[PDB]
Every structure is written in structure tokens, then in C-alpha cells.
JSON list of C-alpha atoms and ligand atoms in Angstrom, two decimals:
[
{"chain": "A", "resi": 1, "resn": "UNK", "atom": "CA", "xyz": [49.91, -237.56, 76.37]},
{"chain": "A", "resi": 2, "resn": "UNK", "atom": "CA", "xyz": [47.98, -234.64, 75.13]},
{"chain": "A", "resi": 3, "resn": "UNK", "atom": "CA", "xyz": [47.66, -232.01, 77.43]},
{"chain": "A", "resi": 4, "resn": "UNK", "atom": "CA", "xyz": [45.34, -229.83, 75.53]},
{"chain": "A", "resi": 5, "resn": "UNK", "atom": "CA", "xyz": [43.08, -232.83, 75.08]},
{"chain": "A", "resi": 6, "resn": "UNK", "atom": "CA", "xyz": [40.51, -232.48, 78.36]},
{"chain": "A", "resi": 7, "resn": "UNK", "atom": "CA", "xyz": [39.12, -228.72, 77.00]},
{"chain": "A", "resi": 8, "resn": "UNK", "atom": "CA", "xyz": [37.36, -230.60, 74.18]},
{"chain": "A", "resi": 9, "resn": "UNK", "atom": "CA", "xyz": [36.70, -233.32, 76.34]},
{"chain": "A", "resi": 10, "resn": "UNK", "atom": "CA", "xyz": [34.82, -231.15, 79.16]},
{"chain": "A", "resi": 11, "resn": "UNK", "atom": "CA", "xyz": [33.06, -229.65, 76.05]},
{"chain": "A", "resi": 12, "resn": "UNK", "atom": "CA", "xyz": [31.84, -232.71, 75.26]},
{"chain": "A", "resi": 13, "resn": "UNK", "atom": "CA", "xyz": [31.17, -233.62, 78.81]},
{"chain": "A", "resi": 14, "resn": "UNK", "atom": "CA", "xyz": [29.10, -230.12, 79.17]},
{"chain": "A", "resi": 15, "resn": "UNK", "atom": "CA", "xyz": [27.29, -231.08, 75.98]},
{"chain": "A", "resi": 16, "resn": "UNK", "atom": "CA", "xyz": [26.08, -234.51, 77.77]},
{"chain": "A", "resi": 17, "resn": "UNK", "atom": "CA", "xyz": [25.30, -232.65, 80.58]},
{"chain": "A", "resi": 18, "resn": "UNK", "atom": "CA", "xyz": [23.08, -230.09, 78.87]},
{"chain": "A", "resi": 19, "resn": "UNK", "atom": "CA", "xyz": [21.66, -232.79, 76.68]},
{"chain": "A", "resi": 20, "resn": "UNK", "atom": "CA", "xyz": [20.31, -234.61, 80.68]},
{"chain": "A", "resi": 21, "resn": "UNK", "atom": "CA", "xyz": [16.92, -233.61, 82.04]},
{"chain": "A", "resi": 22, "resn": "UNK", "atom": "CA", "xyz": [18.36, -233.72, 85.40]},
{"chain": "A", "resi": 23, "resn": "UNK", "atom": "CA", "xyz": [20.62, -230.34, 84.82]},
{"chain": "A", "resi": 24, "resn": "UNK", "atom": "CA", "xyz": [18.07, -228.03, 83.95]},
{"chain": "A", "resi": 25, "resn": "UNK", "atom": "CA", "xyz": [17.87, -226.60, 88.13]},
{"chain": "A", "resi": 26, "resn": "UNK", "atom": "CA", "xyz": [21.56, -226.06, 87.41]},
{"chain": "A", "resi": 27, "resn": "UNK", "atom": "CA", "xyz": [21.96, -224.81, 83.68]},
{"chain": "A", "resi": 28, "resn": "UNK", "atom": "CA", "xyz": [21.71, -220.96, 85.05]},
{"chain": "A", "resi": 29, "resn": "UNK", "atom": "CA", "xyz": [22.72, -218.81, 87.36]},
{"chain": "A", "resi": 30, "resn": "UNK", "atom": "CA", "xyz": [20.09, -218.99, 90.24]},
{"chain": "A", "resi": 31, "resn": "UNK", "atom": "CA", "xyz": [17.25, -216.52, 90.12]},
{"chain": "A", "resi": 32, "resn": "UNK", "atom": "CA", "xyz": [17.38, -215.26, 93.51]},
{"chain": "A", "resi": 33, "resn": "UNK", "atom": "CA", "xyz": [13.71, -213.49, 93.15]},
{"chain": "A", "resi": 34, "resn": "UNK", "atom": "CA", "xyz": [12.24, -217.64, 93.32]},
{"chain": "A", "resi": 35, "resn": "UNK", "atom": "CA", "xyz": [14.91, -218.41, 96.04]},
{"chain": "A", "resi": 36, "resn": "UNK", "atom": "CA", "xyz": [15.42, -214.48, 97.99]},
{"chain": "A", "resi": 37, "resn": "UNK", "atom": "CA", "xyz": [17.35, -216.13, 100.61]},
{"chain": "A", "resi": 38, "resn": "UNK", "atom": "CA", "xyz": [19.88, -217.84, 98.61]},
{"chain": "A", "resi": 39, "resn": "UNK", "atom": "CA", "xyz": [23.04, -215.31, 99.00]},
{"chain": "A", "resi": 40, "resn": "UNK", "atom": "CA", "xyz": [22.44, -215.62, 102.97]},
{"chain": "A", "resi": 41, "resn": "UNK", "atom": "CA", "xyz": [23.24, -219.33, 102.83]},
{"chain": "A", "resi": 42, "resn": "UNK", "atom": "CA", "xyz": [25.66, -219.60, 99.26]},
{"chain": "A", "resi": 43, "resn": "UNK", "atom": "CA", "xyz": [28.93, -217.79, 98.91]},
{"chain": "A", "resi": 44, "resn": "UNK", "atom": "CA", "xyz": [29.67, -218.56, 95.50]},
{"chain": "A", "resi": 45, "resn": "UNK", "atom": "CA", "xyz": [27.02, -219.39, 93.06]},
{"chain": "A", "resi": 46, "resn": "UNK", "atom": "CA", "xyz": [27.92, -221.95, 90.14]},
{"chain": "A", "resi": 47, "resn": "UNK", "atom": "CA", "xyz": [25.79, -222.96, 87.50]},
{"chain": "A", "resi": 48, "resn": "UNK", "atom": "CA", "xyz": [26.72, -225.35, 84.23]},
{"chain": "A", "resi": 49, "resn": "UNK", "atom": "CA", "xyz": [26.70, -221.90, 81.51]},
{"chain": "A", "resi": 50, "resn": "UNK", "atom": "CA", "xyz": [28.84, -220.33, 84.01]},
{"chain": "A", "resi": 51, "resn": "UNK", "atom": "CA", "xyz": [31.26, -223.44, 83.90]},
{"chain": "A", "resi": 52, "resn": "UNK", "atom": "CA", "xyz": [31.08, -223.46, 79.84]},
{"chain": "A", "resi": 53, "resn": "UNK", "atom": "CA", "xyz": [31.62, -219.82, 79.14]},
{"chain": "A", "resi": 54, "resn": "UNK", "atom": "CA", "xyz": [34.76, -220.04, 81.84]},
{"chain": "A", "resi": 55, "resn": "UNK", "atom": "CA", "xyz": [35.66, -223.02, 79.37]},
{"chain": "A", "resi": 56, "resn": "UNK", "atom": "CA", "xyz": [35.04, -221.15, 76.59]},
{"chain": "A", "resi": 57, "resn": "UNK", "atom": "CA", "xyz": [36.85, -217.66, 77.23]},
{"chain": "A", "resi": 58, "resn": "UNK", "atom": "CA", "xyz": [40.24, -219.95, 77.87]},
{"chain": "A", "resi": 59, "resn": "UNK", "atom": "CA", "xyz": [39.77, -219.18, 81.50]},
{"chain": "A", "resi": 60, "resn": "UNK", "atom": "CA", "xyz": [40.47, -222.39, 82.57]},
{"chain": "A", "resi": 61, "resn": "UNK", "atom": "CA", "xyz": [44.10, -223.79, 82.69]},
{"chain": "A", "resi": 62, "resn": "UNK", "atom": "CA", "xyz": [43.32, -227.38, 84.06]},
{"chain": "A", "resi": 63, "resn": "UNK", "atom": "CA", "xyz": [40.41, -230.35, 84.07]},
{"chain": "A", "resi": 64, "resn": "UNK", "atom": "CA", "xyz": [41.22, -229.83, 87.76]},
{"chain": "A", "resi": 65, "resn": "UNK", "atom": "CA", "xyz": [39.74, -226.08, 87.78]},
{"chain": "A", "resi": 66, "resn": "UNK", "atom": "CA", "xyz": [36.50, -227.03, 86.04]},
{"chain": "A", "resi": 67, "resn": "UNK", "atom": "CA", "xyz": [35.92, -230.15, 88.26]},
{"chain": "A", "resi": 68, "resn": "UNK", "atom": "CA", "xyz": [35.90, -227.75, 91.24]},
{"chain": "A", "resi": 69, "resn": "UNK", "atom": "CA", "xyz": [33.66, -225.59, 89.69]},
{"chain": "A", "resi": 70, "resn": "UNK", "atom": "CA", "xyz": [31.15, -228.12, 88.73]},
{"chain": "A", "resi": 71, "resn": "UNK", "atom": "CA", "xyz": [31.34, -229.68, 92.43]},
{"chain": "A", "resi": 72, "resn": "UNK", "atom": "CA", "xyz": [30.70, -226.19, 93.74]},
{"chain": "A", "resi": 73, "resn": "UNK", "atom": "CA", "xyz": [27.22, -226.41, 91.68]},
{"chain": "A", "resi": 74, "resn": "UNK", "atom": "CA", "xyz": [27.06, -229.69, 93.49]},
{"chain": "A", "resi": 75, "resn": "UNK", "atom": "CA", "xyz": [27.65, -228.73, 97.09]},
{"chain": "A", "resi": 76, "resn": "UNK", "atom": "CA", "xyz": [25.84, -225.30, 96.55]},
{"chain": "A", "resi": 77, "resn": "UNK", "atom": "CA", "xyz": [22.44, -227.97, 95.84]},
{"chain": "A", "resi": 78, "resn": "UNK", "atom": "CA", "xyz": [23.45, -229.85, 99.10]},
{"chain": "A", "resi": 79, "resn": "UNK", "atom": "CA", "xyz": [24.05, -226.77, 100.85]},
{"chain": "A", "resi": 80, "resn": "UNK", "atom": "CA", "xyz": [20.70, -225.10, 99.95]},
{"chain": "A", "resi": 81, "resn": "UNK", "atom": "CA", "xyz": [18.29, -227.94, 100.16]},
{"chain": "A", "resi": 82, "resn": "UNK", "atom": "CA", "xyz": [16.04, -227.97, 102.67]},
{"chain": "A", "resi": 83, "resn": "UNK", "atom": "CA", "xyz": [15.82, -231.61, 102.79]},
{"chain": "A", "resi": 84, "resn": "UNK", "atom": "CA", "xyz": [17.90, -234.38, 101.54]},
{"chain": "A", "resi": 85, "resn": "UNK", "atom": "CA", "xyz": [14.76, -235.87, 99.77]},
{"chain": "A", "resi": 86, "resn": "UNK", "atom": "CA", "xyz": [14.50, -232.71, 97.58]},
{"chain": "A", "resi": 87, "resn": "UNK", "atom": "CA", "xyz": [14.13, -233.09, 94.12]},
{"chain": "A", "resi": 88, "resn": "UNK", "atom": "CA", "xyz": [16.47, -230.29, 93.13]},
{"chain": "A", "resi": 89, "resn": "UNK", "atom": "CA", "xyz": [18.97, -232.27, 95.25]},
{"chain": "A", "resi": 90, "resn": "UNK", "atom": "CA", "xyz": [18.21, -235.29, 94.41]},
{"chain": "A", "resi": 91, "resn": "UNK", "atom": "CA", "xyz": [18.78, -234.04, 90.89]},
{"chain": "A", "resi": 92, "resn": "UNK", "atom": "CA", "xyz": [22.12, -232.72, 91.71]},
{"chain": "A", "resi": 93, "resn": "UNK", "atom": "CA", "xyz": [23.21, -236.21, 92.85]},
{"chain": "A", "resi": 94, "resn": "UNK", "atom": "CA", "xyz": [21.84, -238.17, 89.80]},
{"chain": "A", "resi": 95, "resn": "UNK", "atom": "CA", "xyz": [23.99, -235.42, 88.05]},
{"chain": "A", "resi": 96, "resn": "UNK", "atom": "CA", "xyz": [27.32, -235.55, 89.86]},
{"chain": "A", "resi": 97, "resn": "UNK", "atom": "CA", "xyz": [27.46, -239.27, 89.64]},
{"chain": "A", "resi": 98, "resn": "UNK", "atom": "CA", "xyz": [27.31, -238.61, 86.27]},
{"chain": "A", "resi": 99, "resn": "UNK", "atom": "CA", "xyz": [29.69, -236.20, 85.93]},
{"chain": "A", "resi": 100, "resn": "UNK", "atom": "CA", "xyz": [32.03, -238.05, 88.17]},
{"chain": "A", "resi": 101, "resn": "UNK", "atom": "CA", "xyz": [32.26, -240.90, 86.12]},
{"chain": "A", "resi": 102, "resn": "UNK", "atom": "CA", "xyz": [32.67, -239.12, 83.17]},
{"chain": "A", "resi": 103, "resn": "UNK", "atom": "CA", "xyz": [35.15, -236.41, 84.63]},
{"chain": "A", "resi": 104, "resn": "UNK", "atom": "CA", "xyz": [37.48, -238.93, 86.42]},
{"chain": "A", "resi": 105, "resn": "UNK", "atom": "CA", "xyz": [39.55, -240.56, 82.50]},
{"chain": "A", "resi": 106, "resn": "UNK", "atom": "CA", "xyz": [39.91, -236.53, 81.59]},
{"chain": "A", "resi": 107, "resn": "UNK", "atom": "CA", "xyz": [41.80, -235.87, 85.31]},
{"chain": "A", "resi": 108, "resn": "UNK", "atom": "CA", "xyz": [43.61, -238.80, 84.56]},
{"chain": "A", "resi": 109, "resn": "UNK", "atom": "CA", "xyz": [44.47, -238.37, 81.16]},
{"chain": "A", "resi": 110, "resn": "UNK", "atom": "CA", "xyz": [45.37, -234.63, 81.67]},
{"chain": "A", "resi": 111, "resn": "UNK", "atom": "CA", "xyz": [47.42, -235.48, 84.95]},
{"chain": "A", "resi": 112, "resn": "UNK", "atom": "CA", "xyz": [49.19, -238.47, 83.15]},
{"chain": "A", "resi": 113, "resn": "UNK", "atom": "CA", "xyz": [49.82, -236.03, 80.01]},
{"chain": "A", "resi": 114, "resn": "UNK", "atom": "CA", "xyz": [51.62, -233.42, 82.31]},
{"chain": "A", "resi": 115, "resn": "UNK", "atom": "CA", "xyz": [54.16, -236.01, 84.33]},
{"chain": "A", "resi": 116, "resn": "UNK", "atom": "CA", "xyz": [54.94, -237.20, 80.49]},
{"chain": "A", "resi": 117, "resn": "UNK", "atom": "CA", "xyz": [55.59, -233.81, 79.53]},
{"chain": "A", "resi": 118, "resn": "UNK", "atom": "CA", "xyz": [57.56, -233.05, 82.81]},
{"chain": "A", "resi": 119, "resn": "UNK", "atom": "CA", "xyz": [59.52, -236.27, 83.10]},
{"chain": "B", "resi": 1, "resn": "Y44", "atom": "O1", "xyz": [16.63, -221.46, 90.42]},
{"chain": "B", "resi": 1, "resn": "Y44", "atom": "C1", "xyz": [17.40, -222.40, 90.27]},
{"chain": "B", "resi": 1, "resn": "Y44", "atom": "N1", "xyz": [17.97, -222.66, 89.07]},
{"chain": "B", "resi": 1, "resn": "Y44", "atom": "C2", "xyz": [18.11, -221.65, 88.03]},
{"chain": "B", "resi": 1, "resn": "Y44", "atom": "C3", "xyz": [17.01, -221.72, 87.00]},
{"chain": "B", "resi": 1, "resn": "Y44", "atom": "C4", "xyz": [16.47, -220.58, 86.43]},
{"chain": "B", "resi": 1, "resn": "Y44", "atom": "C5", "xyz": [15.47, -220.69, 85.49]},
{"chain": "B", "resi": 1, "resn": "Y44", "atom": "C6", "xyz": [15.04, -221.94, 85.13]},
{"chain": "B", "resi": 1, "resn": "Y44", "atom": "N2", "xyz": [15.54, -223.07, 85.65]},
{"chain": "B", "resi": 1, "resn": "Y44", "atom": "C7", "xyz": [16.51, -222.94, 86.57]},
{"chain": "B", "resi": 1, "resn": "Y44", "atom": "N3", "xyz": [17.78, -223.16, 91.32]},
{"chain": "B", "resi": 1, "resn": "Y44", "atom": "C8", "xyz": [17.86, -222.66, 92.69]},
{"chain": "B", "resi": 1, "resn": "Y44", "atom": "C9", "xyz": [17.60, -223.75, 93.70]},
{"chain": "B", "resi": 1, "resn": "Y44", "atom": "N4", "xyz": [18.56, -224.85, 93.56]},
{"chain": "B", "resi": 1, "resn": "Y44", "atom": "C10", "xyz": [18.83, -225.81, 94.46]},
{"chain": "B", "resi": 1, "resn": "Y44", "atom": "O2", "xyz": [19.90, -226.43, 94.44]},
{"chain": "B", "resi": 1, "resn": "Y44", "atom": "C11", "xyz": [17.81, -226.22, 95.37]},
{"chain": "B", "resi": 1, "resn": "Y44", "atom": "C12", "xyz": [16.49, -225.84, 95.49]},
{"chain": "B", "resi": 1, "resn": "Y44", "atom": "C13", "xyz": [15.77, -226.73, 96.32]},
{"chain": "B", "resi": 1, "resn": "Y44", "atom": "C14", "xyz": [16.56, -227.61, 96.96]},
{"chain": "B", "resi": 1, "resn": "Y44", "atom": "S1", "xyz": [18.19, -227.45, 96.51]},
{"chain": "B", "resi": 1, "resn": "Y44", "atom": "C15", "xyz": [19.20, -224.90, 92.25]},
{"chain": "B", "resi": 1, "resn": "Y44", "atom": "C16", "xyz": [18.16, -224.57, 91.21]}
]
């Protein structure tokens, strides 16, 4: 019933993440001069530092917040490929599988945690 207890836990997470070959299209903001076209098709960039240093600066107040950011890396992939058989893409789904399995004990945890502290 720790409600602080997902921050370290998406740390860790991140650190897996990092640690996986199939992150490195997503560990930095997109360089737009090898993809010129990208801001006509993607509102809101997301990238995995971007997610960590939001973690990091104690600019996130939920598990909830960072799991939307991390999707948004997801769906930005989906979004931009030109094809479904990409291998950026299909890099981005290897990784959100991933992440989902890993992400979905920290929601619960933190969510369970709250209605504790709230009963
Ligand atoms: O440039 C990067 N990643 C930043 C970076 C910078 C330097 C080194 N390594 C990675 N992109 C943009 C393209 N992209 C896609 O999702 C797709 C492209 C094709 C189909 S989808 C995400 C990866």
C-alpha cells in the first residue's frame, strides 16, 4: 500500500527498457533532419529519455501519467510507419508488449495503494 512505490519501479522498468536492443529507434527525441516530414504527421513527439527525465524532475504524479507517455512513443511508431511490416514498428510492438506486461503490477499496485489510503 505504498503509493510512492511505482517511481522506483518505472525507474527500474526504464532501466530494462534501455538495457533492450529493441528501444534504441525510441531512446531520443526524433531527429527530424533523417525523418523531415515527421511534425506534418506527429503532434506530440515522445521518446524513452523524455519519459525518464519527466520521471526524474518529479514531474510525474501517477504510474498512470508515464504509461500514457510511453504509449504515445508507441502510437507515434504506428502512426508514422509506412508499413506495418516496418522494422521500427515492428520494434515498437516487441517493446510495448514488454512494457505492458511489466507496467500493468505498478498501475495496480499504485491504484490499489491509493483506494487503501482513501478508504
Ligand atoms: O529517428 C528516430 N529515432 C531517434 C534516434 C536518433 C538517433 C539514433 N537513434 C534513434 N526515429 C524516427 C522514426 N521512428 C519510427 O517510429 C518509424 C520510422 C519508420 C517506421 S516507424 C522512430 C525512430
Amino acid at each position: 500500500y505504498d503509493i510512492q512505490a511505482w517511481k522506483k519501479q518505472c525507474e527500474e522498468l526504464l532501466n530494462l527498457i534501455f538495457q533492450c536492443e529493441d528501444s534504441e529507434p525510441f531512446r531520443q527525441p526524433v531527429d527530424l533532419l533523417e525523418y523531415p516530414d515527421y511534425r506534418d504527421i506527429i503532434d506530440t513527439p515522445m521518446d524513452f529519455a523524455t519519459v525518464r527525465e519527466t520521471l526524474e524532475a518529479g514531474n510525474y504524479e501517477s504510474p498512470m501519467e508515464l504509461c500514457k507517455d510511453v504509449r504515445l512513443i508507441f502510437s507515434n511508431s504506428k502512426a508514422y510507419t509506412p508499413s506495418k511490416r516496418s522494422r521500427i514498428y515492428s520494434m515498437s510492438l516487441r517493446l510495448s508488449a514488454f512494457f505492458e506486461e511489466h507496467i500493468s503490477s505498478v498501475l495496480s499496485d499504485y491504484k490499489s495503494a491509493l483506494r487503501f489510503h482513501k478508504r
